[PDB]
C-alpha cells in the first residue's frame, strides 16, 4: 500500500524557513517518479511547486523564485521541502504526491498539513458547553455542542464521545477574529440518551499539545 | 504559463441525472507521443484532491466506471454519469504536459435534493465562558436544503448586527443538505443588561421565520 504523508510545524514566522517531510510508506524513494509537493492556499487554489527525482534532481515552480528546495533521505524513505523568507502569502495546506511520467498519482497524495505563516501567538482554545436553554419536545431528539473559542494556529480535531458519536455532528468551519480562532460543533442524539448518557467532546490543538475534554452537563 | 479554465455549473443536479464538467486550454496538451496530458481529480469535501482520470481519458485504478474523460487537446470532458450524493465536491482540471503543470480553478459540483427546513437550537453562555468575562450566544441550523439561508438576531426584541459571526458547512456527501453556525458575542456586562435573546431563521421553506429564544 503506497501512503504518503506530511508533517511539520503548523506556524511559522515571517522571514524564516517552512520545513515540511514526507514519509513514504509501502515504496522506496528510489523507485522511479517525481516525488513532489503542492499547496493549496486559503480559498482553494492549487500550486504545483516541484519535484525531486532520482534521488537528487530537482525542478520548481518559477512562481517560488530562489526560495525553494526539495531534498531526501533515502535511508528514512523521506523526502523534504524547504521555503525560505515566508511570509503570510505561503500559509496554505501543503501536500506531497507521487507523479509518475503521465501524470498518475495513484491514491498517493498526502492528508495535507496546514501550515500558518504569521507572527501571532500559539494560543490553546477555551471549551465551552452548550447546553440546552430549557426543556423541549422529547421522546424525539436533542441537539448540544461545543464553543471553541479563542486559538491559534488552525487546525482543531473535534470528537463526540471519543469518537464513539460519529453520526449526527457538525462541526463548523472556524471564523478568525483579532488573530484567534472560533468554530463550535454540534452533535444530535435521540432524547433517551441524554442526559442519561454522558455526552463529552473532545478537543485537540496539537499546535499547542492542548487536549480538552468537556462533558456537557444539563442547565 | 498554460491557462486552464474550467466552466462553473450553473445547476444543481439531481440524484441519478448525469452531468458534463469542462476545461479549456490556452495550448494544446496533446504531446509528441500522441497523448494528451491532461488529469482530472476531485476534491471532496475535508478530504485531499482524488485522481479520476490521468492522460485526458484513462481512468485511474479504483475509480468508478462512472467517470469517464474525454475531449481534444485544448477542450476536456468529465462526464460523470449517474451522480450520486457522494460525488458532492470540487473537481479540478491539471494539465501535465509542461511545467509548472497548472490546475484549474475547480467547478463545484451541487447535488439537488428535496427542500428541507432547518433544525434550529440556541444556547445561552456557558457559565464558565461567563466567569471569564465573555458571553457568547450559539445558534445552529442544522440540515437545510438549499442553501440559501438568513439569520437573524434580537436581543429584547430588538435586531441586533454587531458581534456576530457566521459559519456554513459544505454539502454533505451523504444527506445533501447544508448547516450553519450563529455567534453573537458580548461582555458578560452587557449580557447581563438584557433578558430575551433570539435567533431567527428565514428560509424558502416557510414564509414566517423559524424563532428560537430564551430568557437570561
Known amino acids: 500500500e503506497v501512503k504518503l504523508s506530511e508533517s511539520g510545524p503548523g506556524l511559522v514566522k515571517p522571514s524564516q524557513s517552512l520545513s515540511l517531510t514526507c514519509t513514504v510508506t509501502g515504496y522506496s524513494i528510489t523507485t522511479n517518479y517525481a516525488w513532489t509537493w503542492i499547496r493549496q492556499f486559503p480559498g482553494n487554489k492549487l500550486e504545483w511547486m516541484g519535484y525531486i527525482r532520482s534521488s537528487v534532481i530537482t525542478r520548481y515552480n518559477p512562481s517560488l523564485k530562489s526560495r525553494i528546495s526539495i531534498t531526501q533521505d533515502t535511508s528514512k524513505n523521506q523526502f523534504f521541502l524547504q521555503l525560505n523568507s515566508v511570509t503570510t502569502e505561503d500559509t496554505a495546506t501543503y501536500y506531497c504526491?507521487?507523479?509518475?511520467?503521465?501524470?498518475?498519482?495513484?491514491?498517493?497524495w498526502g492528508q495535507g498539513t496546514s501550515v500558518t505563516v504569521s507572527s501571532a501567538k500559539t494560543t490553546p482554545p477555551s471549551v465551552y458547553p452548550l447546553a440546552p436553554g430549557t426543556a423541549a419536545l422529547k421522546s424525539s431528539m436533542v441537539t448540544l455542542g461545543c464553543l471553541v473559542k479563542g486559538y491559534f494556529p488552525e487546525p482543531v480535531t473535534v470528537t463526540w464521545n471519543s469518537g464513539s458519536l460519529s453520526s449526527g455532528v457538525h462541526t463548523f468551519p472556524a471564523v478568525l477574529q483579532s488573530d484567534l480562532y472560533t468554530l463550535t460543533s454540534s452533535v444530535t442524539v435521540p432524547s433517551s440518551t441524554w442526559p442519561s448518557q454522558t455526552v463529552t467532546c473532545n478537543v485537540a490543538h496539537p499546535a499547542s499539545s492542548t487536549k480538552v475534554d468537556k462533558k456537557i452537563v444539563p442547565r | 504559463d498554460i491557462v486552464i479554465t474550467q466552466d462553473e455549473l450553473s445547476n444543481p443536479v439531481t440524484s441519478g441525472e448525469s452531468v458534463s464538467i469542462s476545461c479549456r486550454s490556452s495550448?494544446?496538451?496533446?504531446?509528441?507521443?500522441?497523448?494528451?496530458?491532461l488529469n482530472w481529480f476531485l476534491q471532496r469535501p475535508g478530504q485531499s484532491p482524488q485522481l479520476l482520470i490521468y492522460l485526458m481519458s484513462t481512468r485511474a485504478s479504483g475509480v468508478s466506471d462512472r467517470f469517464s474523460g474525454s475531449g481534444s487537446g485544448t477542450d476536456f470532458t468529465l462526464e460523470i454519469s449517474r451522480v450520486k450524493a457522494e460525488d458532492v465536491g470540487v473537481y479540478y482540471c491539471?494539465?501535465?504536459?509542461?511545467?509548472?503543470?497548472?490546475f484549474g480553478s475547480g467547478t463545484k459540483l451541487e447535488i439537488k435534493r428535496a427542500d428541507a427546513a432547518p433544525t434550529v437550537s440556541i444556547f445561552p453562555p456557558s457559565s464558565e465562558q461567563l466567569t471569564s468575562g465573555g458571553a457568547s450566544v450559539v445558534c445552529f441550523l442544522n440540515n437545510f436544503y438549499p442553501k440559501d439561508i438568513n439569520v437573524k438576531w434580537k436581543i429584547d426584541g430588538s435586531e441586533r448586527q454587531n458581534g456576530v459571526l457566521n459559519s456554513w458547512t459544505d454539502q454533505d456527501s451523504k444527506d445533501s443538505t447544508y448547516s450553519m453556525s450563529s455567534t453573537l458575542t458580548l461582555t458578560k456586562d452587557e449580557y447581563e443588561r438584557h433578558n430575551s435573546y433570539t435567533c431567527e431563521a428565514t428560509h424558502k421553506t416557510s414564509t414566517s421565520p423559524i424563532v428560537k429564544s430564551f430568557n437570561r
Open positions: 495550448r494544446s496538451l496533446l504531446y509528441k507521443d500522441g497523448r494528451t496530458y
Open positions: 504526491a507521487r507523479y509518475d511520467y503521465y501524470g498518475n498519482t495513484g491514491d498517493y
Open positions: 491539471q494539465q501535465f504536459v509542461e511545467y509548472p503543470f497548472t
